[PDB]
């Protein structure tokens, strides 16, 4: 394979996170390139399974999707990608940077996500787990979709009920992701547990306009949360709308205490 690299060229420097199937490190590839490394714990998940994510990441290439660099496909396995220096968008949003972000910065982060998701849309792919926790941040507020291989509060009804997952339910999640960006990281449907979210959402309920969030962005949310998956906007739409936001939609926008 072209993506193969010598085990020697990889250095795992800082441990970044853990899971049941492996770990994620910051490190150095060929002694020069800062990379992110993800490992599989031999025996926990099947190699074939843990490699299905890298196989996918091979046919994908977009500036708003985390990029594969190399793999070591013989146990123990390592997948290598570019390194995002700020971690998940969810830790960023509720961390020290939280308090300085306003609408322009947040609507721009959203746009990029929609740009990456528009690419995913174009390729007829589905993500299935779009949400802030699965967006990585970089230098200068660069946001890239991550993880290409239950989150009920993020999942569209038809997908959680009848397993009908699509780019249109991905759009639903994006709608839920917009509340995360506007509440600076707060769990959707506050004080509601999974079971009553299903009931309520199936009964027509939708989260209201977050504090200081312009109505125009709440409407955009509500469009992504239409009951009929086909009514829901495309990503190519969502992308254009958010890039043009402060000219075409909210030109009279004044800074507030939080947004």
Catalytic-residue membership of 199: no
Spatial distance between the Cα atoms of 89 and 229, rounded to a whole number of angstroms: 26
Residue 21 annotated as part of some ligand binding site: yes
What is the total residue count of the chain?
259
- DSSP letters spanning 126-146: --S--SGGGEEE-TTS-EEE-
If one asks whether residue 236 binds ligand 1N1 (CB under 6 A), the answer comes out as no
Instruction: Give 24 or 142: the residue with its C-beta nearer to ligand 1N1.
Output: 24
Near ligand 1N1 in 21-80, by CB under 6 A: 24, 36-38, 53, 66, 79
If one asks whether residue 103 binds ligand 1N1 (CB under 6 A), the answer comes out as no
Q: How far is CA 178 from CA 31, 134, 141, 203, 214, in A?
A: 39, 13, 16, 21, 12
Residue 17 annotated as part of some ligand binding site: yes
Of the listed 1, 91, 108, 129, which one is catalytic?
A: 129
Q: Among 86, 94, 102, 226, which residue sits at the site for ligand 1N1 (rule: CB under 6 A)?
A: 86
Three-state secondary structure string covering 207-256: CCCCCCCCHHHHHHHHHHCCCCCCCCCCHHHHHHHHHCHHHHHCCCCCCC
DSSP 12: E
If one asks whether residue 146 binds ligand 1N1 (CB under 6 A), the answer comes out as yes
Binding residue numbers for ATP: 16-24, 38
Residues that bind ligand 1N1 (CB under 6 A): 16-17, 24, 36-38, 53, 66, 79, 81, 83-87, 136, 146-147
Residues annotated as catalytic (active site), given as ranges:
129
The binding site consists of 16-24, 38
């Amino acid at each position: 394979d072209a993506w193969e690299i010598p085990r020697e060229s990889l250095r795992l420097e800082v441990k970044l996170g853990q899971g049941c199937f492996g770990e994620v490190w910051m490190g150095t590839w060929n002694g020069t390139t800062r990379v992110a490394i993800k490992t599989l714990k031999p025996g926990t998940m099947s190699p074939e399974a843990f490699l299905q994510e890298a196989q996918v990441m091979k046919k994908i290439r977009h500036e708003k999707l985390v990029q594969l660099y190399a793999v070591v496909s013989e146990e123990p396995i390592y997948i290598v990608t570019e390194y995002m220096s700020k971690g998940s968008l969810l830790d960023f949003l509720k961390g020290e940077m939280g308090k300085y972000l306003r609408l322009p910065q947040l609507v721009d982060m959203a746009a990029q996500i929609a740009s990456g998701m528009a690419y995913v849309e174009r390729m007829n792919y589905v993500h299935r787990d779009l949400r802030a926790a699965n967006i990585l941040v970089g230098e200068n507020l660069v946001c890239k979709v991550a993880d290409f291989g239950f989150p009920i509060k993020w999942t569209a009804p038809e997908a959680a009920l009848y397993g009908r997952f699509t780019i249109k339910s991905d759009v639903w999640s994006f709608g839920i992701l917009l509340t995360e960006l506007t509440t600076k990281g707060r769990v959707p449907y506050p004080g509601m547990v999974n079971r009553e979210v299903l009931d309520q959402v199936e009964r027509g309920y939708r989260m209201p306009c977050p504090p200081e969030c312009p109505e125009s962005l709440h409407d955009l949310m509500c469009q992504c949360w239409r009951k009929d998956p086909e009514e829901r906007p495309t990503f190519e739409y969502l992308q254009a709308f958010l890039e043009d936001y402060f000219t075409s939609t909210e030109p009279q926008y004044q800074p507030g205490e939080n947004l």
